[PDB]
Amino acid sequence: VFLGFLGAAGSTMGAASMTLTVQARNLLSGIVQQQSNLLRAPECQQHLLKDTHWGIKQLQARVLAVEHYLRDQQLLGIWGCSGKLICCTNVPWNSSWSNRNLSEIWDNMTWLQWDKEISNYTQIIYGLLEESQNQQEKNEQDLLAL
Amino acid sequence: VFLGFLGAAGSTMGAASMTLTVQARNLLSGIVQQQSNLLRAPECQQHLLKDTHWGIKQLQARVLAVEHYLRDQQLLGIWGCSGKLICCTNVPWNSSWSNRNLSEIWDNMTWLQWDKEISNYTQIIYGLLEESQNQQEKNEQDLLAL
Amino acid sequence: VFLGFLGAAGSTMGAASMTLTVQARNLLSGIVQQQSNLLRAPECQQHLLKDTHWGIKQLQARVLAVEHYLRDQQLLGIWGCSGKLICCTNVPWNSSWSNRNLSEIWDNMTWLQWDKEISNYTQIIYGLLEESQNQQEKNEQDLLAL
Amino acid sequence: QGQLVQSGATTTKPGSSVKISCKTSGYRFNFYHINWIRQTAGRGPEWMGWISPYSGDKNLAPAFQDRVNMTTDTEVPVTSFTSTGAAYMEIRNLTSDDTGTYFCAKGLLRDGSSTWLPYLWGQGTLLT
Amino acid sequence: VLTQSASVSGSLGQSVTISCTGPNSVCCSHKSISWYQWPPGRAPTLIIYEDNERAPGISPRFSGYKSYWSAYLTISDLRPEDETTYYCCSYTHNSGCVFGTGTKVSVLGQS
Ligand SMILES: *[C@@H]1O[C@H](CO)[C@@H](O[C@@H]2O[C@H](CO)[C@@H](O[C@@H]3O[C@H](CO[C@H]4O[C@H](CO[C@H]5O[C@H](CO)[C@@H](O)[C@H](O)[C@@H]5O)[C@@H](O)[C@H](O[C@H]5O[C@H](CO)[C@@H](O)[C@H](O)[C@@H]5O)[C@@H]4O)[C@@H](O)[C@H](O[C@H]4O[C@H](CO)[C@@H](O)[C@H](O)[C@@H]4O)[C@@H]3O)[C@H](O)[C@H]2NC(C)=O)[C@H](O)[C@H]1NC(C)=O
Ligand SMILES: *[C@@H]1O[C@H](CO)[C@@H](O[C@@H]2O[C@H](CO)[C@@H](O[C@@H]3O[C@H](CO[C@H]4O[C@H](CO[C@H]5O[C@H](CO)[C@@H](O)[C@H](O)[C@@H]5O)[C@@H](O)[C@H](O[C@H]5O[C@H](CO)[C@@H](O)[C@H](O)[C@@H]5O)[C@@H]4O)[C@@H](O)[C@H](O[C@H]4O[C@H](CO)[C@@H](O)[C@H](O)[C@@H]4O)[C@@H]3O)[C@H](O)[C@H]2NC(C)=O)[C@H](O)[C@H]1NC(C)=O
Ligand SMILES: *[C@@H]1O[C@H](CO)[C@@H](O[C@@H]2O[C@H](CO)[C@@H](O[C@@H]3O[C@H](CO[C@H]4O[C@H](CO[C@H]5O[C@H](CO)[C@@H](O)[C@H](O)[C@@H]5O)[C@@H](O)[C@H](O[C@H]5O[C@H](CO)[C@@H](O)[C@H](O)[C@@H]5O)[C@@H]4O)[C@@H](O)[C@H](O[C@H]4O[C@H](CO)[C@@H](O)[C@H](O)[C@@H]4O)[C@@H]3O)[C@H](O)[C@H]2NC(C)=O)[C@H](O)[C@H]1NC(C)=O
Ligand SMILES: *[C@@H]1O[C@H](CO)[C@@H](O)[C@H](O)[C@H]1NC(C)=O
Ligand SMILES: *[C@@H]1O[C@H](CO)[C@@H](O)[C@H](O)[C@H]1NC(C)=O
Ligand SMILES: *[C@@H]1O[C@H](CO)[C@@H](O)[C@H](O)[C@H]1NC(C)=O
Numbered sequence A, B, C: 001v002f003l004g005f006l007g008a009a010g011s012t013m014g015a016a017s018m019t020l021t022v023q024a025r026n027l028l029s030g031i032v033q034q035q036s037n038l039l040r041a042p043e044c045q046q047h048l049l050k051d052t053h054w055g056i057k058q059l060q061a062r063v064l065a066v067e068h069y070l071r072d073q074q075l076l077g078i079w080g081c082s083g084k085l086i087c088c089t090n091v092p093w094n095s096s097w098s099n100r101n102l103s104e105i106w107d108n109m110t111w112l113q114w115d116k117e118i119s120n121y122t123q124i125i126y127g128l129l130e131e132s133q134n135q136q137e138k139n140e141q142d143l144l145a146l
Numbered sequence D: 001q002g003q004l005v006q007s008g009a010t011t012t013k014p015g016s017s018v019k020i021s022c023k024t025s026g027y028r029f030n031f032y033h034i035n036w037i038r039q040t041a042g043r044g045p046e047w048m049g050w051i052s053p054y055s056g057d058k059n060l061a062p063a064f065q066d067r068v069n070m071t072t073d074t075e076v077p078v079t080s081f082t083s084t085g086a087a088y089m090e091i092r093n094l095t096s097d098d099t100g101t102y103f104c105a106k107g108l109l110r111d112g113s114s115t116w117l118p119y120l121w122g123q124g125t126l127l128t
Numbered sequence E: 001v002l003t004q005s006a007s008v009s010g011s012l013g014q015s016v017t018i019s020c021t022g023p024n025s026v027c028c029s030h031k032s033i034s035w036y037q038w039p040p041g042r043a044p045t046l047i048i049y050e051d052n053e054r055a056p057g058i059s060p061r062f063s064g065y066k067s068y069w070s071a072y073l074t075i076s077d078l079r080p081e082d083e084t085t086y087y088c089c090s091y092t093h094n095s096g097c098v099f100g101t102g103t104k105v106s107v108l109g110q111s
Helices: A012-019 A022-024 A031-036 A053-078 A102-106 A111-118 A122-144 B011-017 B020-027 B031-036 B053-078 B102-106 B110-117 B122-144 C013-018 C018-023 C031-036 C055-077 C102-106 C109-117 C121-144
Strands: D003-007 D018-025 D035-038 D046-051 D059-062 D066-074 D075-077 D082-085 D086-091 D102-108 D118-121 E015-022 E032-037 E045-048 E062-066 E070-075 E087-091
Touching: A012 A022, A012 A102, A012 A111, A012 B122, A022 B053, A022 B122, A022 D003, A031 A053, A031 C013, A053 A122, A053 C018, A053 C031, A053 C055, A122 C013, A122 C018, B011 B020, B011 B102, B011 B110, B011 C121, B020 C055, B020 C121, B031 B053, B031 C055, B053 B122, B053 C055, B053 E062, B102 C121, C013 C018, C013 C102, C013 C109, C031 C055, C055 C121, D018 D082, D018 D102, D035 D066, D046 D066, D059 D066, D118 E045, E015 E087, E032 E062, E045 E062, E070 E087
Parallel strands: none
Antiparallel strands: D003 D018, D018 D086, D035 D046, D035 D102, D046 D059, D066 D086, D075 D082, D102 D118, E015 E070, E032 E045, E032 E087, E062 E070
C-alpha cells in the first residue's frame, strides 16, 4: 500500500527513497489535467481570455511549473542520469559536508532535515557533479583524438 | 521509401513500429517552425500582440503542444526508457487484457484498433509500470543501505 | 580553471569539446532565475501584467527559450543519446562532406568554422541519423516478432 | 588558402644589422606560428627559430640564440576567420658566411605535437 | 647532426626509398620525423606531417615509416616532377627542427 503523494516526507530517507516515484508523479499529473484543456475547451470558448489577464496570469503559472520540471531534467541530463531515478557517480564524498555514518543517515534521518543540513554545500557538490563528468568527457576525448 | 507522417496508421503494428521515428518527428518540426520566430521577428514587430489576445491565445496553443511532449517524455522517464524508442520491461503480460497471440497481433492488427481494444486496462498497465520500476528502486536500495 | 560561458569558442574543437558542459549550463541558469519568480513574486504583484503586454511579450520570450531546449533534447532523444553529452553512432562518415583529416580537424579548427563548413550537409547527416536508428528499431523488431 | 608575402631582397656589407618583413593574409595570423629558416649555399640548411604571434613566446636554435630578435605585429582582422599581420626578423652581427636564401613559414596545426612545424612558405630572399 | 641517407634514384613507375638517422641523442625513436621536398633555391613543400601521417593535400603514394633507430620515406608511382632535393627533420613540442644533410638525386625512366 502506497502512502500517497509526499507520504513518506516524515519517514526515514530509505523509506522515501523507496517511494520516490510517488513524489515524481505530482510533476506530471498536475500538468496533465491543465494541458488537457478538455473541460476547458468548451466553457466559454477558452475561458474568456480577452480582457481577462488572470487568464494569461494563470497561463504564466502553468509555464513556471513546466519550467521547473525542465530545470530538474536538465540537471539529471548533465549528470548523465537522465533515464534513471537512482544513479551512482564518481564523485567521492568529502567528510566535511556531513560526518554521520550510513546507518544513522538512512535509518534515523528524514530527507527534510538532511536537505537542511546539506543546503550549505549543495552548490559545491553540484560543481563536483558538473566537473566529475568532465573526466568522462575527457576519456571520450581520448577516444576521439585517437 | 518512407510513407510520411502517420503513413503507417493503417498498416500492421509491426510496420508502424518500424516507422515510429516518422510519427516522433511531428512533435518537433511543428514546434521548430513556431519557436523559430524568424518569419515572425519582423512582421509588424511581434505580430502586434497589444490589443490582440488571439496572439496570447495562439501562444497558449503552442504551450499546450510542448506541455503534451513533456507528458510523454515524463512517462518514458519514470519507466526508465528515456533514451530509447523501444524498451522491454519486467512487467509480465496478464492475459485478461488481450487473449490474442503474437502473430495475430503484429501481423493482423493496426495500432488504432489495438489502442481501442486495450484503452480499458491502460491505467492498470501504467500502474504496474510505475510499480515494477519500484523493485528496481528497491534493488538499488539494497545496494544503498549496504 | 574554466574559461567561462562560451570561453572556448575560439579554441580548437577538442578544447571546446572538453568544456561543453560550460555551454550546456547557459541553457538552464538563464531560465532558473526567470522561473524562480522570487524577486518577481512581490514587486507590484506579478510585475503588473494587466494593461502591460510587454509582460506577456516578455513571457513569450521565456517560452521561446524553453522551446529551443526542447528541440535539442528531442534531437538527442531520437538519436538515442539522451543521457550522454558525447555519443557515437553507426552512421559512417561520407567523405564528400569534408575531406579534412582528424588531426587537422580537432587540433587546427574551431567549432564555428566547422559548423560553417558543414552547414550545407547538416540536413543529410540528420537524415542518416534518423534513418540509421531505424535499423536498431528493426533489430528490436526482429526481437519483437520472435 | 593562406599567403605569405616577403619583403624585397637587398645586399648589405657585413658588420651592419638588417630587417626582413613577412606579411601574411588568407588565415588567422594569431592561429599559426611563424618560423624563419635559412638555406646555406655549400652546406645543409638550418632551422633558425620560431615565435608565436599570440602568446609572444619565442624559442630559437642555440646557433642563433643571442644573435636574433623576433617581433610579431598585432594581427589585422579581415574576415570572421581571416586576418593579416607582419612578422619581423633581425640579425645583430653580419658576416660573409651569413650569405644564403631565407624563408618565412607558418604553422601546420594549432595544437598537438606538430604545432610550430613549418607548412606554408614564402617566396624567399637572397643576401650578400 | 642528422645524416640523411645517400641519394638513390630509379626509373618512373617503380618505388624509391630514402632514409634518415642520427645519434641516439637525436635518433628516430622518441622523436618526430618530418619530410620535405626542397627544390634548390625555391619554396619548399611539406610531405609528411608526422612519421606515419601526411599533410593536407598529399598524394597517398607518399607513405612513411619509422623504426626504433632510423626513419624512411617511400615514393611510389614515380613521375617527372619527382626530380628534386629532399630533406628530413626531427622535432618535438618544445624543441626545434634539426634538418638532415639531404638527398638530392632523382632520375626519370626513359629520360
Ligand atoms: C513515524 O515515526 C515512527 C518513529 O517512532 C515510525 O515508527 C517506526 O516504524 C518502523 C517501520 O515503519 C519500525 O521499524 C521496524 O520495526 C520492526 C518491528 O515491527 C514489528 O514489531 C513491533 C514491536 O513489537 C514488539 O512488541 C510485541 C508485543 O506487543 C512483541 O510481540 C514483538 O515480538 C515485539 O517485541 C510492532 O510494534 C510492529 O507493529 C505491529 O505489531 C504490533 C504487535 O507486535 C501491533 O501492536 C501494532 O499495532 C502493529 O500491528 C511490528 O509487529 C522491526 O523489527 C524492524 O527491525 C528489523 O526487523 C524486521 C523483521 O521484523 C526487518 O524486516 C526490518 O527490515 C529490520 O531489519 C524495524 O525497526 C520502527 O521500529 C518504528 N519506530 C518506533 C515505533 O519508534 C513510523 O513508521 C513513522 N511513520 C512514517 C510514515 O514515517
Ligand atoms: C493496406 O492493407 C493491405 C491488406 O490487403 C496491405 O496489403 C498487404 O501488403 C503486405 C506488404 O505490404 C503483404 O505482405 C507480404 O506480401 C508478400 C507478397 O508480396 C509479393 O507477392 C504478391 C503476390 O503475388 C502473387 O501473384 C503473382 C502473380 O500475379 C505471382 O507471380 C507471385 O509469385 C505470387 O504468387 C504481390 O502482390 C506483391 O506485389 C507486387 O508484385 C505483383 C506481381 O507479383 C504486382 O502485380 C504488384 O502490383 C506488386 O508490384 C509482391 O510481388 C508476401 O510474400 C509476404 O509473406 C512473406 O514473404 C516475403 C517474401 O516474398 C517475406 O519477405 C515476408 O517478410 C513474409 O515473410 C507478406 O505476406 C500482404 O500480403 C498484403 N495483403 C493483401 C494484399 O491482402 C497493404 O500493404 C496495406 N497498406 C498499408 C500502407 O497499410
Ligand atoms: C588562441 O589561439 C592560439 C593560437 O596561436 C592558441 O595558442 C596555442 O595554445 C595551445 C595550448 O592552449 C598550444 O598547444 C600546446 O602548446 C604546448 C606548449 O606549451 C608550452 O611551450 C610553449 C613554447 O615554449 C617554447 O619556448 C620556451 C622558451 O621561451 C622553451 O623553454 C620551451 O621549451 C619551448 O621550446 C610556451 O609558450 C607555453 O607557454 C608558457 O611557457 C612560456 C615559457 O616556455 C611562457 O613564456 C608563457 O608565457 C607561458 O607561461 C608552454 O610553456 C605544446 O607543447 C603542445 O604540444 C604537445 O606538448 C605538450 C607537452 O608540453 C602536451 O601536453 C600536448 O598535449 C601536446 O601533445 C601544444 O602544441 C599551442 O602551441 C598554441 N599555439 C600558438 C601559441 O601559436 C591559444 O591557446 C588560443 N586560445 C584560445 C582560448 O582558444
Ligand atoms: C574536504 O575539503 C576540505 C576543504 O574544502 C578539506 O579540508 C578536507 O580535508 C576534505 N576532506 C576530504 C578530502 O576527505
Ligand atoms: C490477471 O488478473 C486477473 C485479475 O485482475 C486474474 O483473475 C487473472 O488470473 C490474471 N491473469 C494472469 C495472472 O495471468
Ligand atoms: C558520398 O555520397 C556521394 C553522393 O551523395 C557519393 O558520390 C560518394 O561516393 C559518397 N562517399 C562515400 C560513400 O564514401
